[PDB]
A paper describes a structure:
In contrast, clinical modulators such as benzodiazepines that treat anxiety, muscle spasm, epilepsy and insomnia bind at the extracellular interface between the α-subunit principal face and the γ-subunit complementary face (between α1/2/3/5 and γ2) and do not induce obvious conformational changes to the pocket in structures solved so far. Instead, here we performed rational engineering to generate high-yielding, high-stability, simplified homomeric and heteromeric constructs based around the α5 subunit that could be structurally resolved by X-ray crystallography or cryo-EM.
Comparison of an α5V3-[name] structure solved to 3.24 Å resolution in the absence of ligand versus the α–γ site in wild-type αβγ receptors reveal close similarity (RMSD peptide Cα backbone α5V3-[name] versus α1β3γ2 [name] or DZP-bound: 0.85 Å or 0.75 Å, respectively). In terms of global receptor conformation even though α5V3 lacks β-subunits to bind [name] and initiate gating, α5V3-[name] is more similar to the αβγ [name]-bound state than the αβγ inhibited state (RMSD peptide Cα backbone α5V3-[name] versus α1β3γ2 [name]-bound or inhibited: 1.66 Å or 2.4 Å, respectively). Consistent with this the α5V3 ECD matches the ‘twisted’ ECD conformation of [name]-bound αβγ receptors and the M2 helices lining the pore are retracted such that the hydrophobic leucine activation gate (at what is dubbed the 9′ ring) is open. Similar to previous reports for [name]-bound αβγ receptors the desensitization gate at the bottom of the pore at the −2′ ring position represents the narrowest point, with a diameter of 4.1 Å. Although theoretically wide enough to permit the passage of Cl− ions (Pauling radius of 1.8 Å), the hydrophobic nature of the −2′ ring of Ala side chain methyls is expected to prohibit permeation, although other studies propose that such a gate could be partially open. α5V3 is not expected to gate in response to orthosteric agonists of αβγ receptors as it does not contain [name]-binding β-subunits, so we performed whole-cell patch clamp recordings from HEK cells expressing α5V3 and tested agonists known to bind directly to the TMD and induce channel opening. α5V3 did not elicit any response to 30-μM doses of propofol, etifoxine, etomidate, pentobarbitone or allopregnanolone, nor indeed diazepam (n = 6). Neither did α5V3 exhibit any obvious spontaneous resting membrane leak or inhibition of such leak in response to treatment with the channel blocker picrotoxin (100 μM; n = 6).
Author numbering:
A (entry chain E), B (entry chain A), C (entry chain D), D (entry chain B), E (entry chain C): 14 to 322, 393 to 419
Write the structure that this text describes.
Amino acid sequence: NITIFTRILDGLLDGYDNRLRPGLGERITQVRTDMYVNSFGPVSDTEMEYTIDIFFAQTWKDERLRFKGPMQRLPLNNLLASKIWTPDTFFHNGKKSFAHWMTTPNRMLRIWNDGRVLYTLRLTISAECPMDLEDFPMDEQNCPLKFGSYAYPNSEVVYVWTNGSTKSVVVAEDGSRLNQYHLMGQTVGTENISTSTGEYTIMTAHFHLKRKIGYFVIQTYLPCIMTVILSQVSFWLNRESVAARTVFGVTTVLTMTTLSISARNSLPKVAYATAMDWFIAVCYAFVFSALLEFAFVNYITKSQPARAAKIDKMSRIVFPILFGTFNLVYWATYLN
Amino acid sequence: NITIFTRILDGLLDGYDNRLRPGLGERITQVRTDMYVNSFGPVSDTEMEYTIDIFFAQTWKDERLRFKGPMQRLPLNNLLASKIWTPDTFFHNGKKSFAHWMTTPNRMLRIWNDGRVLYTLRLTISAECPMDLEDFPMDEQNCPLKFGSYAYPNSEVVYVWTNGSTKSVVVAEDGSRLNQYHLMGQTVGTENISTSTGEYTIMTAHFHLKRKIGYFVIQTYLPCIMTVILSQVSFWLNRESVAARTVFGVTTVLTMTTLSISARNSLPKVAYATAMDWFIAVCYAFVFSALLEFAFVNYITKSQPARAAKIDKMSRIVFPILFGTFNLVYWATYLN
Amino acid sequence: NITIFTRILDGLLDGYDNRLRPGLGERITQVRTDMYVNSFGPVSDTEMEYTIDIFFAQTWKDERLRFKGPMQRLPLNNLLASKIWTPDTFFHNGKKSFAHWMTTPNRMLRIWNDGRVLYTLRLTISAECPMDLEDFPMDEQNCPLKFGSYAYPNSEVVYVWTNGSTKSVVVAEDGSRLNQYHLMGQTVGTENISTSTGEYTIMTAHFHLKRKIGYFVIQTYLPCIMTVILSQVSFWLNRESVAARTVFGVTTVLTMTTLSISARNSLPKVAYATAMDWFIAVCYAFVFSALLEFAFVNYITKSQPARAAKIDKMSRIVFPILFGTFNLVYWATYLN
Amino acid sequence: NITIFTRILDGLLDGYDNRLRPGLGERITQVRTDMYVNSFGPVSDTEMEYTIDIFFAQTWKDERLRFKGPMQRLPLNNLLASKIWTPDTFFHNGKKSFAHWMTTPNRMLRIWNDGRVLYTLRLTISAECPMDLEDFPMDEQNCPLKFGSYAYPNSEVVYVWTNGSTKSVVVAEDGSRLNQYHLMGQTVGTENISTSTGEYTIMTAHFHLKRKIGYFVIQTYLPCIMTVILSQVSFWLNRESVAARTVFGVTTVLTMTTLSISARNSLPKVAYATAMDWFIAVCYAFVFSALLEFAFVNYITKSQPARAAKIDKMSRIVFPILFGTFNLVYWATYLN
Amino acid sequence: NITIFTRILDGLLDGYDNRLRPGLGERITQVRTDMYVNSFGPVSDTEMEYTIDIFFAQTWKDERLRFKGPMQRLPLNNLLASKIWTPDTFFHNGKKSFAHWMTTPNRMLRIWNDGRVLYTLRLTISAECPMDLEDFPMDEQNCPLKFGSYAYPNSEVVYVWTNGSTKSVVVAEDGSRLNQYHLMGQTVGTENISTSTGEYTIMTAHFHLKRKIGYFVIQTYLPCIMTVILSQVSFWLNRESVAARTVFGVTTVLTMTTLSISARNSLPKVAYATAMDWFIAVCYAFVFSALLEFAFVNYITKSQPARAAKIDKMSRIVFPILFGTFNLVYWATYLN
Ligand SMILES: *[C@@H]1O[C@H](CO)[C@@H](O)[C@H](O)[C@H]1NC(C)=O
Ligand SMILES: *[C@@H]1O[C@H](CO)[C@@H](O)[C@H](O)[C@H]1NC(C)=O
Ligand SMILES: *[C@@H]1O[C@H](CO)[C@@H](O)[C@H](O)[C@H]1NC(C)=O
Ligand SMILES: *[C@@H]1O[C@H](CO)[C@@H](O)[C@H](O)[C@H]1NC(C)=O
Ligand SMILES: *[C@@H]1O[C@H](CO)[C@@H](O)[C@H](O)[C@H]1NC(C)=O
């Protein structure tokens, strides 16, 4: 009762050429793609890439595989995958894609009487995600995933998402777990590209990432915030205490300087200014300006002590308000 | 007397198809899994994953392999592994699983007269272990290990642990050696998951990890503890010594600041506060507040020196008690 | 109607030897190469190399593959690639070249009735790009890409770019995206090299890279600029304030020192001076010289106070002008 | 005269099954192992592992390979290695073992008339070496190397070292070169282990490593030694010089603090105290205590100046002696 | 006219056994080796290894390959490489050697009528280069490259360099480009080694490397040089300025301390002192001694001010001369 299955498989491969796509010279082969994200791996900002584990699935029609038997489906494994024609799908932005072979090559092959074929494949893709860090860290990144045929133009093989966008891409609840990103949602798109070798259909899946703030708050913003507050303490010290107020300005300015370098060490070496950089510069100005106020006051503490005292007392109030006022504009500007 | 063995093996493979699971269309194939952990590799907190070396073993019944002979068992190696059907077991959370091929592919295959099959396989899994670092470092992590069929639904192939939980998972005494973790114990669990391709049985093994404290004590807590004590020394200095007390506050605050950044460098970039972070903040407040006390005292040392002296003398006692009182609440809160 | 295709392929391979190049002993095999850069990967300055993803394409004539049929072209995949002769092309400067095999080996094979063959191959090359960092960061780097035959001398196999330079190399608009480089343009070149085994033709593709400045401005130049300004503040302080002015000179000089080490940490360990290094040295001299002025003034503040005061007042003006004057010469010298 | 060799090899493989161990069902197969260490690779303390390059050799008896001919030996290469049965030897603690295939798979196969077989194989093992860093750096580590059969229990295959321990393991004079370790010697051991699948013989080779001190002396101890001496200089300064002595204590304490963190950065994240840590703590106490002495003296310099001066003068002598006395106990305690 | 080539190749393989070396049992096989270094890769000092890309070539005589035909040579590729016997050459010190397979395995095979064979192979070797850093950085390193047979003793296979040393090893002009090394020249050597398995011939190629100084000058020496000069400035300050001179000594000593740690971070963890370390120690003594002079002077500024002033004035001259005098001895000692 099992030998029946074996005979059918031999018949299907009898006179079957895997080098020829189904329906060659008769029509255009249609392929349906559905993606299930097993886990959305970490996003390496420095390398401008991300890791993803998916169960990539394809469906298409092959008349040569039509069969009649008691069983309407033929679940199988990688053993028969190489014996028949499969599309030469590849990822344009996939820099290094390697499948999993342990314990067994994770491949599923199913066939129905009508000749429909289902070929689900597991993959891990280190695809690149270019990002415009103009509003970093309050940025919404759109990491795409582009794949298509390598040798079959749009006139021979066509890729189309199955059903709607919701069913086309499925993300596991526990899979979408990142340390510094929120997976807001997913979208799909298709387009044609003309090249030297002809037109090729392209399937693009976009993942909307909303960076979660709070790590940099504990890392960069707070030290800058407290650093500015530390410098303003010098305004409460006597003018004649030249040495004491000198340390406050010198130490704070250097403290801000090292934070600027340290903060960008983890950040990618992008040749443009981010929102964080502007925030650092403002904090640098406050501490730097505070030092100037002391130096200017100390310079005129002899000729006109009266005005010098007014500046010191006035300074204690002006700077905290300006720093507080700036923050509301800053955070409100980006958090909206 | 050895040729007898060779003839039997040829007979078993005579007319045997490895593309068809045993008992197809007659019943549901039952698989028993037992795991022996050769060594529990290091846990990379930054990468939120861990390494494990195990002798994964599976057992199932195949009537096609029934044989009669003087020997009741047929120990073998990887040579015959690929010649017969094996389950397409894979690890859902296994990000990169690679077997060991040196000196020889570590695979064992045994067969009995009844047709029972034993297939033990060695593997090294870089599986991911998501962790909720709300109580870090005093946290108990539950790193799971999920595996199941990739192409055979729950209606065809079923995985079940053999005997009880104790015998199902075995850990070598010397294997469970980690630098910053205690292997409290192991547990097993099974569940069904419904997907587009059908229901699949899932086997989950949970390892209970109790992080061992003491590395961070020598790394983060003690420098913070001594740093707070260092700042309080300024309370024992004369008020007029403005420059001397100034250095204590400035240096200590920056010292705490750098520790906060340095401490999280090894810690993963998680977007939420840990218990250690709260401890750092409190230590920051003490040193920061100590500076305020000196600044406030130095500001009113002219108008009302009497009250200023009282604050200084009172400060020497209040702060150490508060810091000592806080620690008892802190450690007792988490160590319980 | 499909079997016709299968018969033709069998006929082509009937009596076809892939170990013999086409037109052997009759003429010289001519190969046309066209390159399409899918994406210009990051350039690792420390490793003096770069990553590139290209669709390398070759064209040549093979009389043995002449065929007659209804279809004038035979699109195919990697399956037939190994069945026929192909050139042993390799990259001389390619340190580690690995192709992409997922989902399928990205290879295209096309044949026409005349016998023309097109063999496009995807590759990722970690080629080395030697750079002369004499004008770093204002440098224009010319990263080449050299490839040629490994076993067929120039007398047997010849590589020539197809059409002009513009069509020979094509770069995708989104592919040429780097963090700290501008892809100004591309060029091609060919040359013969004589070795022990004979003459071999060489095909060289040069990419002109214009480093984009601005990352180092926020990283190195600005801290140096503000550091120099910070030191000059000591010139506005009273001479008798020995301790206060002492901190300015000491802290600034060390600040410059650490920047010099930190700046070169990311830079490759090149045994020669860059333009940035000279800029750092000048900034070091200003801060260092400022300390000398205070020390010299403090030494003669007793014997001849009159001249000491003149130097201090004069110093406040001389140094800022010299630093400002130097920058115009510096930036203008390289930005031209 | 060469064809004679070819005929014999064909005869040996005629009717030879590599899936059956020699002497099956007649006796227990005996295997002799001899190891020649080509080079003892570096030991990664952080990863708790080491690299080793060896020419692993095995010897056993196979009656099926008995032959008669003019030549008493048959030197060969990897070509015939896969054609005959070989043991499934594997390394229990080998985390990632990969052989060398360039230029050719480094395998030797020799056969004599009696049927004795010699199978030498080159390997590189990233085996793990657990270490008890209780006396670090003055520690003697015993890195083992365990290997045995994966599928053949102790009742079928037995591993035994050949001759004595000296001949069993051979280390090249230039191979045993490490940056921070001395290869004192080697030893061998055998034991039986009972598991679920049966008893398996185990062969263990232990390498005695005596860590060479001197790198940490220039890295950790000396900075601590000079740091303590630097703090004691404050004892030679006048009491009224509050600011000057303040810097000594503050800077030295922070200097010790950063050394503690920096020292353990290279050290593995072990959750227990090492000998170096205790040495650091003592040095921390001296600098910390020195600050207390100044603070205590400065506090009572008004009420009882006489006793304050005695403490300062006495302090200059007590602390250096205690630090010197402690070192003799420390180094002598571990260097014995 | 092409079929003639195909027939000859079939005849050569007709009755040809690749498991038997040529001239077996008749003479000793002689192999000539010539090396062409495509590029001398970077030398990783920390890992004590280097990367090299070479076109390794071998030549030997095989009577079985004698043929007669119109063409006197048979250029080929990797296709026929595995069909015939080749030596089992391996690199003793090669830790990880991997060939290049893209676009095609870079292998050339040529045969002449007499039976001479040429087999050029491309390789990339991460060989280890032990170094004695006694005179670092002014050191001349001799990185070797050892290779030989793995299974054929010296009595069967012999390796000999072809012609003289100049022709034996060839280095491309642009290939020998390193960041911190000069390729002074190359040499070859041969020797016999006796082991358990017999005598094996060894071929050794030595590369003479002259480290280029200048990177450490900008990294370590200059900061130390300026640091010493900075400390000596305190000698020009008034004795009563206790606080000011205190900062100079404290900051400079710590600055030297951090440089010592930072300098060795890139340097390998060698357990012995280098020339740079001695230079650092001397610079440490100057800054450390300068602090002692101030402390000693400040201690006796009351009892005998006259002698204290003499020391200060004398100190300003003695220390710069000693530091200048030391450098001439230092650099001249190693630069000769
Ligand atoms: C691509 O080409 C096909 C040709 O049938 C067309 O139907 C489709 O709309 C095109 N897609 C785009 C995005 O232009
Ligand atoms: C999974 O399905 C099987 C069907 O027989 C059932 O017996 C089992 O209880 C199910 N497991 C769970 C966890 O629901
Ligand atoms: C290389 O040799 C060929 C021989 O035909 C010649 O035509 C060509 O000009 C040569 N190229 C160069 C750069 O000399
Ligand atoms: C292991 O078992 C064998 C059985 O023959 C015995 O001879 C040997 O002594 C045992 N080894 C140990 C260490 O117990
Ligand atoms: C190695 O042995 C051969 C034996 O013929 C001898 O000719 C050669 O000189 C020996 N080489 C050395 C370095 O001793």
